Design a protein around this ligand. Sequence first.
Ligand SMILES: C/C(=C\CNc1ncnc2[nH]cnc12)CO
Ligand SMILES: C/C(=C\CNc1ncnc2[nH]cnc12)CO
Lengths: 465, 465
Amino acid sequence: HLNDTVSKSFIGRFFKLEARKTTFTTELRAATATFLTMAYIITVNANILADSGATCSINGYEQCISRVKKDLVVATSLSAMVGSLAMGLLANLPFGLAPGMGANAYIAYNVVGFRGSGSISYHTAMAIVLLEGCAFLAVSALGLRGKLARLIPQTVRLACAVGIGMFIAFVGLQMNQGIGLVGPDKSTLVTLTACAETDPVTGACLGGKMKSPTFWLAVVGFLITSFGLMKNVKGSMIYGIVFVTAISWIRGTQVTIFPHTPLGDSNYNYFTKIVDFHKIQSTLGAISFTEFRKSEVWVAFATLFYVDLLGTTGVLYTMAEIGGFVEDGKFEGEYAAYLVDAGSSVVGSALGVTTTATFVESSAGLKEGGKTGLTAVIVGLYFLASMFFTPLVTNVPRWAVGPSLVMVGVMMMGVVKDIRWGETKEAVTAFVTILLMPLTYSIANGIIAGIGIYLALSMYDVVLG
Amino acid sequence: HLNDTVSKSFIGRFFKLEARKTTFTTELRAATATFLTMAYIITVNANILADSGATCSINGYEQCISRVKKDLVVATSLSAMVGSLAMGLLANLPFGLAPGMGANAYIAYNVVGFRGSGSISYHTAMAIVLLEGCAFLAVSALGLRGKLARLIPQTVRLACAVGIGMFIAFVGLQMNQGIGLVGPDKSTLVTLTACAETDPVTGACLGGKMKSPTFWLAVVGFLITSFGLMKNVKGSMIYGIVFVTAISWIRGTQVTIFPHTPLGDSNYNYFTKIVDFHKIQSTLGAISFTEFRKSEVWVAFATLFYVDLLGTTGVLYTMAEIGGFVEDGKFEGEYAAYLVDAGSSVVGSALGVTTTATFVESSAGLKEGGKTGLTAVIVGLYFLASMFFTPLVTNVPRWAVGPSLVMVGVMMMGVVKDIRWGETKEAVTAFVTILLMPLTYSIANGIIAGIGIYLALSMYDVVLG
Ligand SMILES: C/C(=C\CNc1ncnc2[nH]cnc12)CO
Ligand SMILES: C/C(=C\CNc1ncnc2[nH]cnc12)CO
């Protein structure tokens, strides 16, 4: 009677749990799939921005890097919570707003450079995000984005979704933040280099070729997750992570995360206590409009605004289409939905995380039938759990989210059977968009190429039109 | 009446052009699509084996490299002709046997090394291919391959076909034998580096980022081919090649292939005459069973036999399924079909080209309805044209097959809508097989991973079975 008694309450009527009707047993932990799929962003986003180090400039690792990483974990777990809560409370829609994976490794590497090796610094790197979010507020306010959502052709919009999954899968295979399969080469570009004797500057090999102990633990974790997904276990994407993490927490093995180096007995010294708060102390703020006065920064606002407006608008509409909300070119709550995914970004600058991009992971939740609200709210409430448990989050080895990163791409492939492969006008664009995202290691190079090809081989109908 | 009068002839009854009936206008140049799609192998295969240089050892470029390249063009255009003719004359089936693209950049780089920098030389590199072809003769003779074809699960067999197209597309983007988009990097692995100021050792950039004149000519050639494929032009994959080649043949521009260097006015001195024969003089033979006596060579026969038997058997059956020949687990001519694609390889060693792999390009022909024979025979006869025209074949710039190489992968993607993406057992294997082929730059790493994953997450039903 939990559902029988909750209908006659303001939860039932505010969320409209009588029309488009679903059940709490189909909502409470049948929407945990979204959180268990988006959980990687707590550590993956905090690692990409850590090596950039937008704090404790040249004016090291044991003092500033660790503190910055711990500050960024909380900021990432809070900025996604705020965005998810906003989408759930108003404009009832089951989405998973969180800082995306398309601008993290564009700001941290191309803009600010590795470990501060760049011409643009933090005070003109977060200011760019804040200003572009303010621009998004205005653009969405008058309703331009609402009409612009339908202008993008369907196959480009779907190929972007497939390519994002492929890129997320590819980022989980490198040595930086993955298992460590792919590695560099001279004659070719990428080869299989799961080597035990690695050089701590690149993915090169000194002795190896598939005899590295760490690889044959992420493989086991990936197999457990895959075997648990069949038979329909309620939650398994965390089942394959805890098993690897618990083994890696054992001291003395060759796959440990707690070495005898002086850095190791500080992570281990922190991990001995389970619960800590660790309020943000060195990342909040850090907004300084001072170096805006040259053209170097300005060009890297133009190259970002019109790819972010075009690569994040088409994901919200796609996840609206998959859930079957839009029926006549419109879906309810569109005005508030397109403004929440600008208000979330502004709030983000202040804390120090990058843009929010309406995570394309709500497919997992929608597969189990999340139609009403009370789905983003549950995700947000779950996100107020990986900020009370920072010692158990910042201490997960990087060879534990790889199995959970490849499975994102595996899941985000069932939509490739909707693209029109019969035609030749409508298939070249989709293939180019799918292919250019992983091999160029940037999502910004996939939307632009697809738009440029689709716009080109139609101009004969435009000039004559 | 050309068809009305040819039915009452031994062509009509030997090829059975009354049952499974088709028409000559649907056969003669509605099967030219297969040749116009496989035409790249005349120059791409001759370039991969050229840098290996299995002739004129250290005991240079202007004398031995050019002669070896010209010798290999004829050998490649002849070995594919023999195989295609054999498949057409007996066991009527419309296929396109030719030396594959999976072993060329495994023998030339990993086995023999770059420019002879390896522990295995030519006389134990072609001998391996000859011996493995002799083994294929025996294996196919008693009928083991016929029963082994059906043992491979369907989704693995289809994901291999998709991944081969993806790998062929990826090989057309690098600096070596493609447009020149992708290039190396330090922090990441692959980036967009269409640069004008390239270093002639890698794909690095000194000045560039999409201002290289050569790139914005392969793009134009790709657009012409794409615009010609729509509207159903009889032949357009050669339309987009001749346009680029004719422009590149003009002397004095910055996109020429005839520089003022001493090497240039030897290619130009050859090109001044249109027709030449150039019988093979330095590649035929070169079989010496001498260095077989150590274990280094033996391991690189074992790592090749059981991936070649598993990655070439599943393509023949797949192209039999697409044409709708098999109806009860069997298709006519199976015994001769599985022996032709071993006899073709033996004949291949002697000339100096690598294994034959039943080119997966017959999809283009089958789309226009090639059901009977007289399709491989026409392809073979067309292959006795790019040996009477060597000066116009060896002088095509490498930035002209890139548009024709990416389109192979574009075409070989419509079969991805047959794979069962609904299940989770049957989709992880397909995604892994598709993904591991391009990013690892080897087809041998895709079949093995797919088989290893599919065999693993089914053993619970095997032990209990
Ligand atoms: C479009 C851009 C970033 C979007 N990134 C993402 N957009 C949507 N879903 C995701 N899941 C992980 N990363 C993402 C940058 O142009
Ligand atoms: C299976 C292997 C090579 C097969 N290569 C090819 N197999 C089938 N079709 C093709 N088209 C281009 N290359 C190929 C090596 O294991």
